[PDB]
């Protein structure tokens, strides 16, 4: 029930790269674990976004 929250946040990231977004979601599909690691990558690159 925590992984689905990460699915919601990454899927609703405002200005994420669509190819990178599919990679974050696909990594959340292959292994529902590491939910904090993928959200960390998403927040890391979103903070560097233009």
């Amino acid at each position, epitope marked *: 029930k925590d992984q689905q929250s990460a699915f919601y946040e990454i899927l609703n990231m405002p200005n994420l790269n669509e190819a990178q977004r599919n990679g974050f979601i696909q990594s959340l599909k292959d292994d529902p674990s590491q939910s904090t690691n993928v959200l960390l990558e998403a*927040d890391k690159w979103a903070s560097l*976004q*233009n």
Partner: antibody, heavy 110, light 112 residues
Framework: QIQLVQSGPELKKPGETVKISCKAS????????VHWVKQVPGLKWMGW????????TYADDFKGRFAFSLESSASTAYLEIHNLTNEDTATYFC??????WGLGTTLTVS | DIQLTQSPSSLAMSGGQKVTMRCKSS????????????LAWYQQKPGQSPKLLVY???IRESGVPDRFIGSGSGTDFTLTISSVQAEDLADYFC?????????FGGGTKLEI
């Protein structure tokens, strides 16, 4: 591997113009901004440039003689300083945001 | 503008002992969107470019030894070296990237 490489050291006489390049590799260049930092021999943030649109945003202390530009076909950011003075003598860094810093370029005005 | 006031500018070390450096911001660096504190710690050796040690206040960067420990939230942040080694003799400074005018800490020189 994310890598930033800058141009070599520069020796300039006062009043001239210097242009510093910064070649990037290892990531999508157009998605993440490039920032410029000045290190006097602390650290002072100069500004950033939008990699997608090319629009630069300068700090208050760098609004006059400084200009940021890009060559997207080569993934290279540029820093141009006009009318060089003695205070411009410093090491200039291009940085992929807060993540990765460039190797640096030492400018000496004399 | 957000101002960064670091801890001391110099520190004398005895090999193995713990060293703590502090970074206080005038305003909170915690982003309500992702609940991250937009502050990073960097190590810079003479004649070399700064290296990222900790990002998002307390998250250690890949490749950094686990003795470099960043912590804190809001306005008070600290970078801790559990057992200072000989290869850690360098300058350290914090950086806030919450607002557009990025500001840097004064710098911390680690020497014997």
């Amino acid at each position: 591997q994310i890598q930033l490489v800058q141009s070599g050291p520069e020796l300039k006489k006062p009043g001239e113009t210097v242009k510093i390049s910064c070649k990037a590799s290892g990531y999508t260049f157009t998605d993440y901004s490039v920032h410029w930092v000045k290190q006097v021999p602390g650290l002072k943030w100069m500004g950033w440039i939008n990699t997608e649109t090319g629009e630069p945003t300068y700090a208050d202390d760098f609004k006059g003689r400084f200009a940021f530009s890009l060559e997207s076909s080569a993934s290279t950011a540029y820093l141009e300083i006009h009318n060089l003075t003695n205070e411009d003598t410093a090491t200039y860094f291009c940085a992929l945001g807060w993540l990765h810093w460039g190797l640096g370029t030492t400018l000496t005005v004399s | 503008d957000i101002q960064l006031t670091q801890s001391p500018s110099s520190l004398a070390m005895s090999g193995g002992q713990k060293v703590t450096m502090r970074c206080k911001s005038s305003q909170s660096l915690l982003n309500s969107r992702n609940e991250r504190n937009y502050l990073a710690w960097y190590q810079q050796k003479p004649g070399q470019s700064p290296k990222l040690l900790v990002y998002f206040a307390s998250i250690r960067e890949s490749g950094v030894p686990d003795r470099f420990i960043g912590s804190g939230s809001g306005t008070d942040f600290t970078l801790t070296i559990s057992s200072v080694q000989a290869e850690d003799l360098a300058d350290y400074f914090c950086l806030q990237h919450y607002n557009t005018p990025w500001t840097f800490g004064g710098g911390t020189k680690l020497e014997i």
